[PDB]
C-alpha cells in the first residue's frame, strides 16, 4: 500500500526528465518518447502535491565514540549556498 502511494505520488510526468546523450538524433528521441512515454501520468491523486519547504541548518555536533577502530573520521560543515547564486562559483 505505501509503495503504491509512493509510486502514484511521485513518479509523475511533469517532474521527470528523459535525457539521452550519444550517437542519436533529437528527432529520433522525440519520436520514441512520443511513442512510449505518452500517456504516462500528469494528474495527482487527491491534489496531494509535495512541496519543498525550506530547511534549517541548525549547527551542532555529534560524536560517536567507538575506540575499537584504527582510524578516526571527522567531518565539519557550514552553511548552504544553494544552487542559483554565483556564490556557488
Amino acid at each position: 500500500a505505501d509503495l503504491t502511494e509512493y509510486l502514484s505520488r511521485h513518479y509523475k510526468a511533469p517532474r521527470m526528465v528523459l535525457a539521452a546523450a550519444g550517437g542519436l538524433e533529437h528527432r529520433q528521441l522525440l519520436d520514441l518518447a512520443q511513442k512510449h512515454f505518452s500517456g504516462l501520468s500528469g494528474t495527482y491523486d487527491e491534489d496531494a502535491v509535495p512541496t519543498l519547504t525550506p530547511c534549517r541548518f541548525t549547527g551542532s555536533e555529534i560524536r560517536h565514540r567507538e575506540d575499537g577502530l584504527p582510524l578516526a573520521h571527522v567531518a565539519i560543515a557550514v552553511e548552504g549556498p544553494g544552487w542559483a547564486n554565483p556564490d556557488n562559483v
Binding site: 517532474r15 491534489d47 502535491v49
Partner: protein, 176 residues
C-alpha cells in the same frame, strides 16, 4: 470545509483567491473605470502563466499569490448590506417568526383568518401524510451505514415530496 466535498480542490482555491482580490480591488479603487483598468491588469497577471501544468510550480505561485494578496489588501472591504458583517446582516431577524408556531393562538383570533388556517390545515395534512413511509425508507435504504455525504436524494422513486423538507421549504420571506 463545505457540505458536499470533503475538501476544496486547488482550482477552486485559485478561483476564490481571484474573487477576493477582485473584490478588494473594487473596495480599493473608486471611479470604477480605473478599477476596470486595474482589474484587467490583474487578469493579465493571471494570463501570464495560465497555460502551465507544473502543479508544484502552480502551488509555489499560489503561495506567492497569497503573500502578494496579503501585502496589499484593503482594511474595510466593501461588503454588501446583506453579506456577513454587512450593514444589515439579517436586519429583520427581529421580524422572522418561525412557522412551527402561530398555532398557539385563540380560536376567536383563529376565526378572524379563516382561509389561511384551512389551507394551513391541509398543508399540515400534507406533511403528516407522507412523512413516515417514503421519507424514512428512502433514508434507511439508499444511504450506506456511513452516509459519507450530506446531499440527500430526491424522491425519484414514485410519488410525493423529496425527503426532509419541512424546515427548508417553510422558511420565512427575509423581508416581512
Amino acid at each position: 470545509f463545505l457540505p458536499s466535498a470533503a475538501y476544496l480542490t486547488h482550482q477552486q482555491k485559485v478561483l476564490q483567491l481571484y474573487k477576493r482580490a477582485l473584490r478588494h480591488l473594487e473596495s480599493r479603487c473608486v471611479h470604477r473605470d480605473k478599477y476596470r483598468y486595474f482589474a484587467c491588469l490583474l487578469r493579465a497577471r493571471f494570463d501570464e502563466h495560465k497555460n502551465e501544468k507544473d502543479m508544484v510550480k502552480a502551488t509555489q505561485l499560489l503561495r506567492e499569490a497569497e503573500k502578494e494578496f496579503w501585502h496589499g489588501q484593503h482594511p474595510q472591504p466593501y461588503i454588501f448590506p446583506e453579506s456577513p458583517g454587512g450593514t444589515s446582516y439579517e436586519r429583520y431577524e427581529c421580524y422572522k417568526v418561525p412557522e412551527w408556531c402561530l398555532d398557539d393562538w385563540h380560536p376567536s383570533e383563529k376565526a378572524m383568518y379563516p382561509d389561511y388556517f384551512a389551507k394551513r390545515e391541509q398543508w399540515k395534512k400534507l406533511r403528516r401524510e407522507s412523512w413516515e413511509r417514503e421519507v424514512k425508507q428512502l433514508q434507511e435504504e439508499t444511504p450506506v451505514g456511513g452516509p459519507r455525504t450530506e446531499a440527500l436524494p430526491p424522491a425519484r422513486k414514485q410519488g410525493d415530496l423529496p425527503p426532509l423538507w419541512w424546515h427548508i421549504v417553510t422558511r420565512p420571506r427575509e423581508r416581512p
